[PDB]
Amino acid sequence: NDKLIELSNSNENWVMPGKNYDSNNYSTSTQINVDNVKQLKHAWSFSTGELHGHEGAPLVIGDVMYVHSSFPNKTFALDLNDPGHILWQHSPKQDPAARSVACCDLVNRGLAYWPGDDKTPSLIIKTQLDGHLVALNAKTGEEFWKVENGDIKVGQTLTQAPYVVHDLAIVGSSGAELGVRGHVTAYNVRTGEQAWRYYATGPDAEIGLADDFNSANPHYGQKGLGTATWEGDAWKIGGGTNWGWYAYDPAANLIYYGSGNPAPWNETMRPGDNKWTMTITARDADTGKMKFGYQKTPHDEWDFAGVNVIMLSEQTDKTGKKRKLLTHPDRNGIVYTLDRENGDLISADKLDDTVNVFKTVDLKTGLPVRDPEYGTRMDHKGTDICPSAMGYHNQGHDSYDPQKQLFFMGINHICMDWEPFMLPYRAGQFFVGATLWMYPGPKGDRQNYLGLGQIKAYNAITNEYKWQHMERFSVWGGTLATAGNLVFYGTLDGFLKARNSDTGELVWKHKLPSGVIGYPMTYEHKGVQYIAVMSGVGGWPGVGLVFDLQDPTAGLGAVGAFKNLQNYTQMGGSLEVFSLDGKNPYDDVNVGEYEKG
Amino acid sequence: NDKLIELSNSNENWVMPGKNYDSNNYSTSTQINVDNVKQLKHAWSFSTGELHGHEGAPLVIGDVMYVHSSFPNKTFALDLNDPGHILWQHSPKQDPAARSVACCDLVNRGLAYWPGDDKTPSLIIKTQLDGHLVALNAKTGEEFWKVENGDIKVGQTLTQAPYVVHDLAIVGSSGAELGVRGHVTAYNVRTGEQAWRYYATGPDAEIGLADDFNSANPHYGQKGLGTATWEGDAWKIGGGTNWGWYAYDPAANLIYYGSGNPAPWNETMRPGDNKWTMTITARDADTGKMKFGYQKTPHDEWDFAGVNVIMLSEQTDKTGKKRKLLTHPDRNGIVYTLDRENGDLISADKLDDTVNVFKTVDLKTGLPVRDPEYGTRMDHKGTDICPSAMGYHNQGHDSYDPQKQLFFMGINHICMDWEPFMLPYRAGQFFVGATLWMYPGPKGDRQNYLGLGQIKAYNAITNEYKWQHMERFSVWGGTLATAGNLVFYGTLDGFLKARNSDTGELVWKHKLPSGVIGYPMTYEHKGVQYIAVMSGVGGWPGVGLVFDLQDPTAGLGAVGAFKNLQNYTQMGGSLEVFSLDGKNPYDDVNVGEYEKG
Amino acid sequence: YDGTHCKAPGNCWEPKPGFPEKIAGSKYDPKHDPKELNKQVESRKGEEERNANRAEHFKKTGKWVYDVKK
Amino acid sequence: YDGTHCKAPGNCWEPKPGFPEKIAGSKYDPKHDPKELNKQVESRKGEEERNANRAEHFKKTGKWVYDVKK
C-alpha cells in the first residue's frame, strides 16, 4: 500500500504494527537521546478498562491515537490534543467461551490501518479472540465489516495483529495447541470478500506453492512435502498456525511470516518432518502464492513455534554481495538471515551459547544438526534442554537500526525438562500431550528462579554481539531503536528501560504500573517526541499470575518458571506516555477543563 | 491510641484513614508548593490487578507502603526503597455472590493500622466486601484474626475503612439499600473479641445511649426515639448503616461518625422521624456509649445518607468562645459545625445556594425547614430537587488547613426527579422502592450532561466561601491540603489537579490512567515529599460505565447523570506516585536490577 | 408538613396533606412479615457465637482458627 | 536420528533408536478418528459460505449485515 509507505515516512505517524514494512521498529527522531534521557518524564496515561496481557502497541495517524486491549478486544480512539477525551470506542460482544480455548492468556497484538480513498473511509483493521476480523471506519468506529476467520468449536482463535498490504487485510491463525492446521487469508478491505486463503500442511494446492517454489534452493524441499513428511492424514490437525508478525517487500511483492509448531507436542504421534510448519514463508501479497519456504525446525520436538518477528534490511554480506535480507530470531534458539528474494540462507547464529538442541546449523545444507540427547520422545524425560518451549525468543517485536546495522533483541533464558504422553484428538479440546518443567537457563539463577531474560545487540552479517546484559525476567515485549542512540524496551517486572544503543549501557528506567509484553513506539505530535508503551503483564509468562495457578507444570510449564514474577508485578492494563520533561497538552491547565476560565 | 498519635506526628508516615484523628488530610510538608508545582512529575506507579472503583488511599509506616484494592480486597505491602518489590500480599477468598448485594460498586475505602507491643505484632486492619473484618500481621501479611461482621444473606457487606482507637478496631456497616439496620462494633485487636456493638434504630439499650445523652441540647431529642419515630417494628429493617469516615478526640474519648439513610427510600413506607439514622453521633471509644446525637435529616425523603466525613478543629466562634469543633459536609446539601464536646450546633450552611429541599436550617431549634414542593411521597413525582440522592457531597474525604482555618470541599452538583413505589421486604434482596432521574444542577450543563462538580474553600465560623470553581464531573474523591499553599484532588475524568489553596487558582494537573474516587495523600521518604493517589473510576458515579448500563434510571439513577463520564475515562486500578522532578528510587538505574552491574 | 411542628423534642414528623398519621390499615400498609423482619437479629446471633468460639480458642492455643468446626 | 541423513531434499526424518518408521499398528498408534480429523474443513466451509453471503449482500445494498439470516 503506497499510501501506508508514505504515511510511514512521517514521524508524526506510526501506521502499522512494527511501524513500517521493514518491521524494524526504528525512528529517525533525535529529540530524545543519550545526552538528555535523564530528562524523560511521564506525560500521560490511559487505562483500557481490562486486565490480562496487553500486547502490541498503539497506532498514530496524525491527531488520532488508536489503542487496543486484551479480550474482548476493545478499540479506542484518543485525541492527541486532549488525550483524555475518547473520540470513539468499539466494544465487541463475543461468546465468553472463547476464553476457554486460548492457550496462553487473552492477549491481542494490535491494530492495522487502511488509509482510505474518495469513495471509502479509512479503516482500522482488528482481530477478535473469537475468530473474527473486523474493519472499523477509522473516524467513527462504526462497523464497516466483519468476517468469520476462526471457529472456537474447532479450537481456533485470533491473537495476532492483522496487516494491510495494497487493498488487502491479511490475517493469520491461532490454536496449534488445539490441533489447528495453520491458515492465512487475505480479505479485500473494500468489499470484505475473500481474496486467497492458504494452509501450512497438506497437498501443495492447498498450501499454495508457486510453480518455481524454492528454485534457488531446492535442497530445502520442493513438491509434495506437506503430505510426504507426515503419516497418513496426521497433517490435517497439524499446526503451523501463524500468530506472530509480518513484513513486506513492495518491490518483490512478498510478505514474510513464520509458521508455528506442528501438533501435537508429542513428537512420537507424528513421525516426519511435518513440513510447512516451523517455516519461514514468503508469499506473493496479492495471489498469496508461496515463493519460498525454509523449514527452521524439522519435526519439532520442543514446541519451538516458528512465529517470530521478521526484520528486513539491506547489507553487504561477507563475500561483498550487496543483499536484500530478512532477519529472524527464532524460538529454537537460532537467529536466521536469508536473502529475502530467493531464500539464500546467509547466517544462522545461536542466540546464546547455551543453546543445546542443535550442535550448529549447517549453512550449505541448511539443516540444524540435532543433539539427540536434548530431543524429546515417548517414555523419556528430556532434561536441561535449551531453549525451552517458550523459546530463547518469543513474540516480542524487536528493532533494527539501519544506521548502525545492529538488531536489538529481547531474549529469554529458560531451559526445560519434557515428557510427552498419548492423548486423542477431539475437535475443540486441547491437543498438547506433554508435561514441561521450565527454569532459568545456565547463566541465570536456577535455584531462586530469577535471571530469565537477556538483551543483546547483534550484527546479522559478521555474526557478532556488540553487547549483552542479563535481565531479571525474560524480555518478552520487543524493543524500539532510535536515532537518539537509545534503545527502549519494557520488562515483565514493570520498567520501561532505555539503554545506550552503541554500548548497552543502562541509562534510564521508570516504574510503570504492571509488567510489559508490548513494544514501545514513538511519534512526534506538535514538535514533541513521545514514547508510548502498553503496560499489563500476562501472555504466556503471566499465566500463573493471571489465573492464580501454583502447580509448577501448569500453564504448559510456565507456572514454575515464573513463580517469582508476582513478587514484582500484578495485572494491569494501560498505555503509558513519556516525553522530555513530561511535556504534554495538560501543561496548559485549561486543556480539558469545564471552566476553561 | 497514643502510639498512632505520635507516628501521625511524623511526616514520614500516614498511619490512618484521613491521616490523623482530626481526619483533616493536612500535611505541614512544604517541599512541594505554589512556587515549584510546575516541577511535579510522575515518580512511579503500581497496578493492583483489579478493576472497579478504587477508593480510600494507602497507608505508609516508615519504609512500608500498604495499598488495598476493589473486591476481593487484596492487601499489598510495597517496599518504598524499591517499590516494584512486593514485600507481601493478602488475597482473600470470598463468595462471589457478595458482588450481588453491593449497591454501588465493589469499592473499599482502606486500611487501618495498629502499632504493636513486645508481646504482639503490629497489625493491618482491613474489611472485606463479604462482611469480615480481618487483622493481618503487618510485616508478613499472615492472618492474625478474622471475625464475621456482616452476612450477605441478610443483605449486608463492608465497604468502609475500619479504624483503630486504643487497642480497639472499630467497624461500621453497609446495606441500607437492602434494609439493613445500621450497626457499629468494636473488636479487641489483641484478642479478636467483641468489646461493644450498637445499633442506629430501636430501644435505647440496643442503640447504646449514655445516661446524659444530649443533656446540653435536649431539644435534639433524648429517650425512646429510635422506636417512637417509627411505626411498629419498621425500625428493624431501618437503615442507618455507617459506611463513611471516623474521627476521634483523645481528650473527650469520643469517636464521631454519621449514620446513613433509613430504609426503604420510599418515605411513605415509614412515617416518623426515623431516629438515629441520618445522625451525627459521638460515642465513647471504649464502651461505645452515645454521648450525643444530632439528626440532620429527619424522616429522610431523598436517600441523603448521613455518612459523610467529619473534620475536627479548634476555632474561636462568632461570640468569642474558643471551641473544640467538628465540621461535616452532608449529602443533604448542608455543611454542619458542632462543638465536638456537647453537640452545640454552631453553623449550618448550604453547600450551594441551589439547595432547595430546605429553606434554611434554624440554628436555635436545629430543625431543617422543609420546602414541601421538593419532598417525596407516593403517587408523586418530585421534580428539580436539589440535592439529588447522590448528595451535594458524597464519601470523598476532604481536607482542612488549620493555619488558614479553611476547609477544602469536593462537591457534587446533581439534582433529581424521584417517584417511590411499594415493594415488600425480603431479607437478602434490595429494598429501595424508588426510581430516580438525575442530571447536573442549575449551574452546570443540564442539556449536555456536564458540570456535576464544584470545588470550594470554606470557613466554618464566618460561613464564607473564599473561592469556588465548577468541575466537569463531581469531585468525588476528597482532597488533600498542604503547607506548600496547594490543595490536591483527583477528578472522575482522570486528572490529579492542584490548585493554589489561598486563591483556588488551578496551577497544575496530570492525566492519570483512570478517574479518581480516592483521596491523595503525602509523605516524605528519604527527604523526598511524594504525593500518591489511587486511580480507578467506579463507586456510585461509575456504575453505568463499570457494568455497561444504559437505562438512565439504572444504577439507582446514576446511569443517566453520568452517561458522559465514559467519554473521558474507562476502568483502571492503580496507585500513582508523584514528586518534584519525578525523583524516585529508580533514579538510580541499578535499584531493582538483576545485573546491578 | 414542614418539619417544624413537634409533638415532642426530636419528634416533629407530620403526615402530608392527603396521607395518614398511620399507614397500617391503609393502601400504604407495608404488611411486613415478622419472620423476615427478624432475619438479621438471628443472623447476628450466629456471627457472635462463632466469633466467641474463635476468640476463646485463640486465647487458649494462640492460633486463630476461622472454621469453627475445629 | 541426527536430522542430516535425508532420503530426499526437505525430507530427513528418521525414527529414533528403538522406535518405528511407521507408528500405525504400534503402541504409538494415534488411532485418529477421520470424522474428528475433518471437523475443521467442515467448519471452514460454513464460514466461507456465510462470509460470501455477507459480502454479496454488502455489494448490493452498501451495508454489511453480519447475521446472514437477512
Ligand SMILES: O=C(O)c1cc(C(=O)O)c2c(n1)C(=O)C(=O)c1cc(C(=O)O)[nH]c1-2
Ligand atoms: O500456535 C498457536 O496457536 C499459539 C498462539 C499463541 C497466541 O495466540 O497467543 C501463543 C503460542 N501458540 C505459543 O506457542 C506461545 O509460546 C505463546 C506465548 C504467548 C505470549 O504472548 O506470551 N502467546 C503464545
Ligand SMILES: O=C(O)c1cc(C(=O)O)c2c(n1)C(=O)C(=O)c1cc(C(=O)O)[nH]c1-2
Ligand atoms: O447505606 C449503605 O449501606 C451504602 C453503602 C455504600 C457503600 O457501601 O459503598 C454507598 C451508599 N450506601 C450510598 O447511599 C451512596 O450514595 C454511595 C456512593 C458510593 C460511592 O463510593 O460512589 N458508595 C455508596
Ligand SMILES: [Ca+2]
Ligand atoms: Ca504453539
Ligand SMILES: [Ca+2]
Ligand atoms: Ca444508602
